[PDB]
Amino acid sequence: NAAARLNDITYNRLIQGLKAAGVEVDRKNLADIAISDPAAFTALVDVARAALPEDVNAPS
Amino acid sequence: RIGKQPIPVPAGVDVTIEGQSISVKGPKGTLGLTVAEPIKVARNDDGAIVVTRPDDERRNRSLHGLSRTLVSNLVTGVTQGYTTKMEIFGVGYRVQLKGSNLEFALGYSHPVVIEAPEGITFAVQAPTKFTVSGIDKQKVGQIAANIRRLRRPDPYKGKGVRYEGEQIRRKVGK
Amino acid sequence: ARKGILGTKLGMTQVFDESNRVVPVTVVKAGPNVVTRIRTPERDGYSAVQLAYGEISPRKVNKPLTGQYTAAGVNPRRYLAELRLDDSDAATEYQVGQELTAEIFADGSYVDVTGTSKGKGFAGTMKRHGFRGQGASHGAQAVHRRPGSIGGCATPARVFKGTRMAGRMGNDRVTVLNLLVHKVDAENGVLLIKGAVPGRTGGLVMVRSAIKR
Amino acid sequence: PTYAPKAGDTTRSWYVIDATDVVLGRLAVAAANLLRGKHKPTFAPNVDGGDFVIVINADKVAISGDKLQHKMVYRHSGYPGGLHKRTIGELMQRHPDRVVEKAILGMLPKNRLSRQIQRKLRVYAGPEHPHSAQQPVPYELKQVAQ
Amino acid sequence: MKVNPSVKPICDKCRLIRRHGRVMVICSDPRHKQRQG
RNA sequence: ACCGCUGAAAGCAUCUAAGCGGGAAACCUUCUCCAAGAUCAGGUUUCUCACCCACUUGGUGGGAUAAGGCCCCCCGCAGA
RNA sequence: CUCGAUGUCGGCUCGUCGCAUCCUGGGGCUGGAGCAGGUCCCAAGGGUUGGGCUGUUCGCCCAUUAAAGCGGCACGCGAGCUGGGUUUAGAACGUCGUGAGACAGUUCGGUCUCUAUCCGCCGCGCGCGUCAGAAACUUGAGGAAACCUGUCCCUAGUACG
Numbered sequence: 001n002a003a004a005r006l007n008d009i010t011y012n013r014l015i016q017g018l019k020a021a022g023v024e025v026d027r028k029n030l031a032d033i034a035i036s037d038p039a040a041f042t043a044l045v046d047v048a049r050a051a052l053p054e055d056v057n058a059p060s
Numbered sequence: 061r062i063g064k065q066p067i068p069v070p071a072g073v074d075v076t077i078e079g080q081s082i083s084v085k086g087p088k089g090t091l092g093l094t095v096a097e098p099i100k101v102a103r104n105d106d107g108a109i110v111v112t113r114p115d116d117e118r119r120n121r122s123l124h125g126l127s128r129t130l131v132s133n134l135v136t137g138v139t140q141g142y143t144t145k146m147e148i149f150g151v152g153y154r155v156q157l158k159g160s161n162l163e164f165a166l167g168y169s170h171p172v173v174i175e176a177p178e179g180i181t182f183a184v185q186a187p188t189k190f191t192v193s194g195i196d197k198q199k200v201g202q203i204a205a206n207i208r209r210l211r212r213p214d215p216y217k218g219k220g221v222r223y224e225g226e227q228i229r230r231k232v233g234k
Numbered sequence: 235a236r237k238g239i240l241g242t243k244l245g246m247t248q249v250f251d252e253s254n255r256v257v258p259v260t261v262v263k264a265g266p267n268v269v270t271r272i273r274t275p276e277r278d279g280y281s282a283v284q285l286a287y288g289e290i291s292p293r294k295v296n297k298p299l300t301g302q303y304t305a306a307g308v309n310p311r312r313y314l315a316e317l318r319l320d321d322s323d324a325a326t327e328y329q330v331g332q333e334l335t336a337e338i339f340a341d342g343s344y345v346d347v348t349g350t351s352k353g354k355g356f357a358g359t360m361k362r363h364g365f366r367g368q369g370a371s372h373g374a375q376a377v378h379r380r381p382g383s384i385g386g387c388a389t390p391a392r393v394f395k396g397t398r399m400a401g402r403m404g405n406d407r408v409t410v411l412n413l414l415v416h417k418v419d420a421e422n423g424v425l426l427i428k429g430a431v432p433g434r435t436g437g438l439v440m441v442r443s444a445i446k447r
Numbered sequence: 448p449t450y451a452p453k454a455g456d457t458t459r460s461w462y463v464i465d466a467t468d469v470v471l472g473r474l475a476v477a478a479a480n481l482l483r484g485k486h487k488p489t490f491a492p493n494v495d496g497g498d499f500v501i502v503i504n505a506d507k508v509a510i511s512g513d514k515l516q517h518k519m520v521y522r523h524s525g526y527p528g529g530l531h532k533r534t535i536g537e538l539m540q541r542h543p544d545r546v547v548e549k550a551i552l553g554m555l556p557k558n559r560l561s562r563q564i565q566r567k568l569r570v571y572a573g574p575e576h577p578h579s580a581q582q583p584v585p586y587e588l589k590q591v592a593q
Numbered sequence: 594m595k596v597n598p599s600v601k602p603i604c605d606k607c608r609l610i611r612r613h614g615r616v617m618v619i620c621s622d623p624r625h626k627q628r629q630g
Numbered sequence: 631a632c633c634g635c636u637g638a639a640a641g642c643a644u645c646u647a648a649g650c651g652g653g654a655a656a657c658c659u660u661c662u663c664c665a666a667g668a669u670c671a672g673g674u675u676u677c678u679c680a681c682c683c684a685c686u687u688g689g690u691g692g693g694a695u696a697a698g699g700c701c702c703c704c705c706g707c708a709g710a
Numbered sequence: 711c712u713c714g715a716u717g718u719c720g721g722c723u724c725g726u727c728g729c730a731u732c733c734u735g736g737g738g739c740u741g742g743a744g745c746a747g748g749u750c751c752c753a754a755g756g757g758u759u760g761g762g763c764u765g766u767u768c769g770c771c772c773a774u775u776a777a778a779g780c781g782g783c784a785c786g787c788g789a790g791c792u793g794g795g796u797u798u799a800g801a802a803c804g805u806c807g808u809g810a811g812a813c814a815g816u817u818c819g820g821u822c823u824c825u826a827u828c829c830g831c832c833g834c835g836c837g838c839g840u841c842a843g844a845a846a847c848u849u850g851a852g853g854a855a856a857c858c859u860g861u862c863c864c865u866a867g868u869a870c871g
């Protein structure tokens with residue numbers, strides 16, 4: 001969540017984004033790469049943002 | 061219906077509205093006021109003062125009437141000040157002045173001296189009739205009330221000070 | 235402009251006023267004081283004036299303290315204490331090294347005298363706090379001077395802070411207020427303050443003007 | 448093995464938070480988070496992460512008038528009847544920095560580490576702070592959109 | 594001043610107002626002056 | 631508590647909604663005392679402010695000291 | 711809850727807290743002329759007596775007082791005291807019982823252990839810390855203590871009547 005809000009996303013929506021994008025990387029390795037490879041974490045945030053629905057707040 | 065009517069101005073060479081604030085002046089001393097933020101103040105065709113508000117809200121109706129009456133108070137205080145006629149009753153009770161100050165012999169073991177603050181003046185017409193004049197309506201009324209409360213209410217002999225023409229309640233007594 | 239002097243309690247005596255009334259006086263030798271330092275709001279944060287009092291042999295003062303005295307440009311003194319002043323017009327009259335003396339006070343003025351009250355040792359509750367003690371008879375078993383109860387019961391299961399118990403009395407800073415100055419004689423630097431003054435005969439006292447008047 | 452910060456892995460920066468119109472609670476949460484280091488992905492609850500926080504203009508923190516009149520600060524000396532009442536309004540006049548710092552300290556975890564955490568907090572009533580020897584970067588309060 | 598949880602106008606000139614968060618009745622007759630508490 | 635001033639919503643009125651006053655042994659200052667273990671351990675000053683040796687040469691250990699202090703001694707109205 | 715024990719009433723000593731305030735302080739209304747009151751509101755800072763009777767609490771009384779407040783804290787407080795009452799064993803009276811005996815019926819007599827480990831509290835030191843080591847003088851964050859009241863005189867025998 002700390003890394004996510006350095007990349008301007010809540011952990012809330014980053015987890016949706018990875019689910020929708022089909023990324024099954026667990027939080028062990030998500031946190032560990034948020035520390036070790038922050039650029040890769042930013043890439044993961046980018047794919048999560050893309051996978052998020054346009055209106056994250058409207059019903060599906 | 062208070063608020064939706066312009067402010068008459070006899071002379072008002074420098075009734076100014078700068079940065080959400082009003083300041084009025086003229087043949088007599090100055091006055092200044094700040095108005096609450098929902099209420100605007102502007103001109104009429106003849107150059108009067110009009111107060112406007114966002115329409116139909118509980119808070120803003122009250123503020124709008126408030127502002128209209130307040131600015132009316134400034135624009136009348138400059139043109140002609142408020143003079144409260146107070147008047148003493150009770151044998152042996154009297155007023156007199158020492159410059160801007162005055163004292164009452166209203167039954168105590170000492171005279172009571174009221175030092176006049178700024179913007180307000182004192183004057184006797186008699187050792188019974190006196191007058192508190194000034195250019196701020198709130199200040200004049202406040203100093204007049206300060207005078208009015210010097211003596212406790214006396215519903216038996218009415219001894220004490222009054223405003224003119226205003227009659228206090230009595231009781232039979234003994 | 236609160237004035238003050240550092241002196242020694244020389245003991246008490248009586249004199250008689252003009253009205254032929256006896257007046258118990260503690261005589262205090264308000265020996266001459268030198269200033270040695272002014273406390274200023276912009277450099278120390280508050281207004282005060284140090285006063286040095288009491289002759290001491292210069293060999294008897296350690297060099298950290300002699301350095302302070304010599305930076306003040308005065309002979310080292312024995313006692314040193316600050317008189318605290320109000321927050322304005324502080325040092326318009328006190329100069330480091332000025333010699334302020336007993337007749338800074340006037341006849342009939344009112345003073346506050348601060349001293350260290352006489353030691354009383356480890357004192358019991360009657361002497362220290364005026365406890366009534368217990369009966370001398372009627373069966374009272376070895377509690378004649380004992381405090382009695384010191385708390386409640388299960389509620390609270392404790393004794394409150396500030397409970398008056400036995401302990402050391404005395405050696406407390408004590409100020410007595412509004413003592414009359416019967417007489418100050420300038421010939422020998424003594425003021426005759428009416429009443430009692432805390433501490434030993436010989437102890438250091440600070441005599442200030444009474445702010446309660 | 449999940450990363451655990453070493454001694455020396457903690458890099459500390461300095462922030463200045465302007466409290467001129469910030470609601471006191473918002474300010475306190477932001478200061479506590481920033482001064483603990485919750486915002487950095489290297490966070491560990493057993494480590495003094497977190498940066499130095501200087502709050503300035505503590506006198507003008509946004510406290511509503513009702514709180515300024517009614518919210519009371521309570522201090523018990525430990526003596527009987529030794530409960531002393533102050534009001535947020537009058538601590539704003541006397542020690543406004545104490546109001547801000549008390550809010551921060553209440554937000555901080557109640558534990559030994561927070562005693563060292565709060566050592567990195569400076570709160571100043573005025574617009575000036577003496578800690579210009581560093582280059583304390585200003586920090587504004589932001590909310591991540593969701 | 595009558596301090597009661599039930600305050601109601603006594604005569605026709607008892608104005609019943611609410612000042613400073615509490616209701617009370619003010620009237621020309623001060624005996625009718627009465628406050629909720 | 632209570633008494634007000636100005637004053638709307640509610641053309642009036644109203645101590646109140648904006649605002650401004652008065653107001654008690656209660657509260658806070660002021661008086662007295664404690665108080666920087668206030669670990670945020672403060673401030674103003676003044677004094678010393680100096681060496682020597684060795685090692686794995688290190689905010690290193692020692693030795694010697696300075697300012698200063700302690701213990702010892704003579705006592706105290708200071709005190710178990 | 712406690713029966714491998716949580717000592718019972720009253721007093722004493724020491725308190726501490728609440729306010730539903732007895733006094734002192736501030737007020738509104740009065741069937742408040744004044745003096746006094748009545749009632750209600752605010753107010754817990756301080757104060758709130760000594761005796762007679764009773765084991766008493768309570769209560770009544772005496773003499774005062776500004777006042778002689780009400781409650782909580784194991785009906786505060788017996789590892790602090792007392793031990794008069796109650797509530798062991800002795801004895802008597804009345805009453806009940808055939809009796810042994812019994813009785814919130816009475817009467818006389820009858821007990822009060824402990825060298826303080828821990829917390830707590832009152833004091834006093836030792837150590838270390840407080841970015842060199844010291845000395846003097848200090849700020850005051852924050853606390854503690856303290857906070858009572860009468861009579862008389864003048865105002866003025868004036869206001870009021």
Ligand SMILES: [Mg+2]
Pocket residue numbers: 353354355
């Ligand atoms: Mg002794």
Ligand SMILES: [Mg+2]
Pocket residue numbers: 366
């Ligand atoms: Mg006695």
Ligand SMILES: [Mg+2]
Pocket residue numbers: 366367368369370
């Ligand atoms: Mg005795």
Ligand SMILES: [Mg+2]
Pocket residue numbers: 375376
């Ligand atoms: Mg014995």
Ligand SMILES: [Mg+2]
Pocket residue numbers: 374375376377378
């Ligand atoms: Mg004995």
Ligand SMILES: [Mg+2]
Pocket residue numbers: 597599
């Ligand atoms: Mg009714």
Ligand SMILES: [Mg+2]
Pocket residue numbers: 613
């Ligand atoms: Mg009010």
Ligand SMILES: [Mg+2]
Pocket residue numbers: none
């Ligand atoms: Mg001190």
Ligand SMILES: [Mg+2]
Pocket residue numbers: none
């Ligand atoms: Mg220090």
Ligand SMILES: [Mg+2]
Pocket residue numbers: none
């Ligand atoms: Mg057991």
Ligand SMILES: [Mg+2]
Pocket residue numbers: none
């Ligand atoms: Mg009450």
Ligand SMILES: [Mg+2]
Pocket residue numbers: none
């Ligand atoms: Mg009354």
Ligand SMILES: [Mg+2]
Pocket residue numbers: 754
């Ligand atoms: Mg009391």
Ligand SMILES: [Mg+2]
Pocket residue numbers: 755
């Ligand atoms: Mg007080």
Ligand SMILES: [Mg+2]
Pocket residue numbers: none
């Ligand atoms: Mg007798």
Ligand SMILES: [Mg+2]
Pocket residue numbers: none
């Ligand atoms: Mg009690």
